[PDB]
What we know:
- By secondary structure, this protein is of the alpha+beta class.
- The protein contains 18 helices and 13 strands.
- It has four domains: about 1-145, Calponin-like domain (Actin-binding Protein, T-fimbrin, domain 1); about 145-365, Dbl Homology Domain, Chain A (Up-down Bundle), CATH 1.20.900; about 365-475, PH-domain like (Roll), CATH 2.30.29; about 475-525, Wheat Germ Agglutinin (Isolectin 2), domain 1, CATH 3.30.60.
- Strand 3 (about 395-400) and strand 4 (about 405-410) form a beta hairpin.
- One zinc ion binds next to loops.
Amino acid sequence: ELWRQCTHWLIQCRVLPPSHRVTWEGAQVCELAQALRDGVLLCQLLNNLLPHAINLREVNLRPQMSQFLCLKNIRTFLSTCCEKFGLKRSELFEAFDLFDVQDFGKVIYTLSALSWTPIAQNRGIMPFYSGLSDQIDDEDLYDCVENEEAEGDEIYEDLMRSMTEYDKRCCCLREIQQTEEKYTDTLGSIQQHFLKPLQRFLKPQDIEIIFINIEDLLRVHTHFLKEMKEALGTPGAANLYQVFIKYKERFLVYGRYCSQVESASKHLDRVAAAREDVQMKLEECSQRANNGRFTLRDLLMVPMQRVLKYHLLLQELVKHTQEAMEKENLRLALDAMRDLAQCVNEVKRDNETLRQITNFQLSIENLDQSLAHYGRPKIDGELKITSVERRSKMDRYAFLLDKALLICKRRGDSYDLKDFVNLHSFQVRDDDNKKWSHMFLLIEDQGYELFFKTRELKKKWMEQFEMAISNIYPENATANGHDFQMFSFEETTSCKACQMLLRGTFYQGYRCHRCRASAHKECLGRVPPC
Ligand SMILES: [Zn+2]
Ligand SMILES: [Zn+2]
């Protein structure tokens, strides 16, 4: 069979893990299409053939809760698929031929075409339905995809590159001191050769973005390193677990950094095209500072990576510290540097969420409010509604967010907002497998029925509606006289119950407008009375 040929080829292209369900005796065609319908493997495929065909910031790496994000991946695929691979528009399928399996036959043709490209074969790899929509009705899946932080992870490992179980431990203690010395003077190189020299050329609105950050990082580490060095020089080196813990809250600036970086850096890149006197000098600063091995972009990615490495270094120092009192202490600093890394990962996720939201906002016409105010996307896709003014099933597109349902009519790539629904006032009420009969009710208890193609779709939406509503009105929200509501804190915040940090940059938790308290959703009832 020809889809079996595709499979094999996709495996040869390192796109499909050779242990995946379309590999097993019995594998249906539908299992292949299931694995391609979010355009992710397809996007990776192109990159495995033409390195850098598609920049990852253009790929929606985990789009399964979103028809919108899957479609954008497939369009990115098809589009670079003709613009960078030769293929003619009569040789590449149309999005829904894939995402709604309206003609998977033509998707397989496109790949075969790809396999015969002067590029596929230029690489050693040999070239090569109706009932689909029904059959259809994944940690494994993305094993072969570049995860989002690999680009930076190599810049970092390049920059840092250089028995018994005491030589093993000491070997680790030297990795910690050396990478730190090297990290610390790297920040210094960025200031001295970049941020200072550049200050003059650029408005304090073009550079002011990066400098306050880098400079604060240089000061913290410059000091960090002094105290790291001392605790190491002293016999044994047991004061070390204390340096890490002492500096944890100081290191929370990495949140602000790993939050503003990606934008001042895209801004730097815009002032690239928009000037010659600039583009020409960030080759100088480069050439001068390190002799052209690293651009300023390259270096701005380094702090995001460095902060994520501390728990890893300590994790290994801990494997080789046999002493009982030693271990339980290093595991304290390890606890602190792992939390640090978890906070930064929270900032990375909210960064991404905000990109998706901006994405929806640019494709939604007749929308007069900022989507960010309505919490985070839960799921978006095609359903059928009737309200109390219609009865004939109206086909509509919906975006669900924590605080709102956007009912819309899709017009190609643009979505017209026909009915914003403020979910503060609504509640979910449930009610033979006939395709499109699976409905539950969305009712205000002082005032729509939603139909889903399949039982599983309905379950997946109803589940999201419940999480959304639970976020609006969590348990104990009104407990002890409080009035807790979702809230995006601007400044680093801790909870008035678990005393630990609210994580992220965007709807980190809840706030009682009355006592000013802040809490995690779970910590809510443990919060001292209003
Ligand atoms: Zn808390
Ligand atoms: Zn209160």
